[PDB]
């Protein structure tokens, strides 16, 4: 779909108003690019908090997997976006989510030295 | 043949600036890696045996973290890399790969990570990288003489300079 | 395009050993330079303005003297080289060329000669170099931290290490 | 000529006996390669004293110029072969010889840090 492509792009580029318009015209919130990335993967990794918030309240799937098996929380975890990691955990992001290589968001935070986020993810995991 | 690919990868890297936006990293990764590419780092066995593998959607993140780490330059020196032909893939196995990063002021530290780089390229799928496995044997941290000179009569700073960044 | 040529030149150099006989230098020079090639070095303007040009029959001699000089490795790092097309020749003008040599024990000194490299390649005369002009702006001498560390409490050696090789 | 090529090669590779045979069969002592190098240029640069001596006593031209304008003395000077530089000066090598770039054997010795040879060439030049 063209509409889906435009929404993926708007989310990546941080275009709050364009995301609003595309959704209003019926752009699929759960559209996928070449790499299986959803608008929420792209907004999360690029630090676009407001788009992450709108997507989650308009039905975006919080535990969507890309081709590599990564969730939006993996991506926010890897790229050091603390507010986004929190918004994802509030809306039911799975801390035990594993990529193709069996890595959790925790291990990704560990690997890229994102200390605050690794701590939040450790406390999250203990609580059922 | 696969060598010119790592030529092109090094040359594109030589265009990095702090202005290099998140889109440039995706276009760099699209130019050189397959859609299902996988990147593995194996660390030296002295501070334990550590290994991570990342999928295609975080390969941009990996390269970018080297510059976030303070590198102003990155290039890969491959020494007589062994090329091998399979049906669907070409292998490049270099047991003398040096990963070179320059850092800025004040120490202008150059870091040289020596190890074995094993790559799998997809056979005319535009010769993009399917597998990247870097196994680190040892590293060297180089100091400009001018920085040694300015602290030569300074035990405090010589203590600072005498200690490695990582190990 | 001319860039892959300096890729190939660096890669062949990465095969140098002290066993590399006088015939290997002639075959290296034949692979990369025209029969009437000319090589010019211009030095930094601090210890005077010095310039020499050598003809094709001593270009082997020039490259070889770098290794006789104690280099164990030589490569050229070209940063966004400007390529220009004329009728009979292609020009490559790189204002950020680093000539990198590693030296061996005891100091494992790395020397980095930064300057402008201007090349003229003959237009499909197998893309061999007709003109080589390296104008040196500055240089850096790098010391491994481990060598700093071993002499850190040794004023005598710190005096030795604090002085440049050339200037 | 094939014979000339074989002689150029024998001189380069230090093959004393092969040089003897080729000359005995009428190999041109003043044969030239692609680069205008004579057997004496090649023997001089490769440190082959005995071939340099035989070539000079069998009529080799001591001041032969290659394509770049270099004489055997330029080449011996550049490559640090002191005995050969002396044998060439004894057999009338021109210390004021200039390449295409107006360099003498002296300047070449200077450039490659061949100190002994640069001194001999300076003393030579003063004497007519």
Residue numbers in the entry:
A (entry chain D), D (entry chain D): 219 to 346
B (entry chain A), C (entry chain A): 30 to 196
What does the publication say?
Screening LDB orthologs from different species, we found that Xenopus laevis Ldb1 (XLdb1) yielded the most stable protein after removal of solubility tags. XLdb1 is closely related to human LDB1, but we did not succeed in obtaining diffracting crystals with this protein either, largely because the DD and DD-LCCD undergo nonspecific aggregation over time. None of 35 selected nanobodies facilitated crystallization, but we obtained DD crystals with 5 of 15 selected DARPins that diffracted to 2.0 to 2.59 Å, depending on the DARPin. Remarkably, each of the 5 DARPins (despite their different sequences) recognizes the same lateral surface patch of the DD, perpendicular to its dimerization interface and facing outwards. This patch is highly hydrophobic (e.g., Y81, I83, and L87 engage in direct DARPin contacts), which explains why its masking by DARPins was crucial to prevent nonspecific aggregation of the DD via this patch (called “hydrophobic patch,” below). The DD adopts a cone-shaped α+β barrel-fold, composed of a long, highly curved antiparallel β-sheet (formed by β1 to 6) whose cavity is filled by 3 α-helices (α1 to α3) that run roughly parallel to the β-sheet. This structure is capped by a short C-terminal extension at the apex of the DD, formed by 2 intertwined α-helices (α4 and α5) that contribute to the dimer interface. The whole dimer interface is extensive (burying ∼1,500 Å2), which explains why the DD dimer is highly stable in solution. However, none of the known DD folds contain an intertwined apical extension, as seen in the XLdb1 DD. We conclude that a lateral hydrophobic surface patch of the DD is crucial for its association with SSDP.
The Chip/LIM-domain binding protein (LDB)–single-stranded DNA-binding protein (SSDP) (ChiLS) complex controls numerous cell-fate decisions in animal cells, by mediating transcription of developmental control genes via remote enhancers. Chip/LDB and SSDP both contain N-terminal dimerization domains that constitute the bulk of their structured cores. We recently discovered that Chip/LDB and SSDP form a stable complex called ChiLS (Chip/LDB-SSDP), which binds to NPFxD motifs within the nuclear Wnt signaling factor Pygopus (Pygo) and Osa/ARID1A, a chromatin-binding subunit of the BAF transcriptional coactivator complex. Here, we report the crystal structures of the DD of SSDP and XLdb1, in the latter case with the help of DARPin (designed ankyrin repeat proteins) chaperones that mask a hydrophobic surface patch of the DD required for its SSDP binding.
